[PDB]
């Protein structure tokens, strides 16, 4: 599924991401923008033989297992296939543990390159939330 | 790059020692830390158990950590290496690189000689 921007903004508000850990909603919508392009099906194979999965591109080395990543620690306790869903629940709840891992939203490099320090509110503007 | 000081340490029975690791300038998080050693009279490397005589301090602001071992005997002789671990939500090649790096190592010798103290 390719979310539209305000559609994703409304589902993330419902899943409790707004101000979760001090990070307002825009940060989250913006992250899925530059990680997935709002695509729940997005996957990318990385050169360590790990894979990044779903709307927030969660990495198979640390968070989910997929049977073909060496040393997968499966910290969210879920198969990676769960994160490729239309329903953003699995990814949201694994996002919540990730953001709580010590480094806040700095875990997501696309977030760090394109959203951090910018006016991230803009991404929920014109969404009538 | 992971900087481990010092390179060698020689101590008498009963002393203690500090190995230090420093994760030299980077954006990458110190998410956790492993200590390993190769016993004297062995070429196989095993992991250390934090607790008891093995005091670890981790300072992730400064991206540093250290292993203190109290009350040495000849059983603590060997080579000691730290390895850091840096976790990221989505893939960062820079931080993945870091999970393959060990400290330089510290060769540690404990003398048990007669009439020899601290």
TrEMBL record, chain B:
Keywords noted in UniProt: Adaptive immunity, Immunity, Immunoglobulin domain, Receptor, Signal, T cell receptor
Disulfide bonding pattern of the chain: 21-82
Protein name, entry field: Antigen receptor
Example of a GO cellular component annotation carried by this entry: T cell receptor complex
Keyword Transmembrane helix: no
Keyword Chloroplast: no
Domain Ig-like: 1-83
Molecular function in Gene Ontology: peptide antigen binding
Covered residues, full protein: 13 to 95 of 108
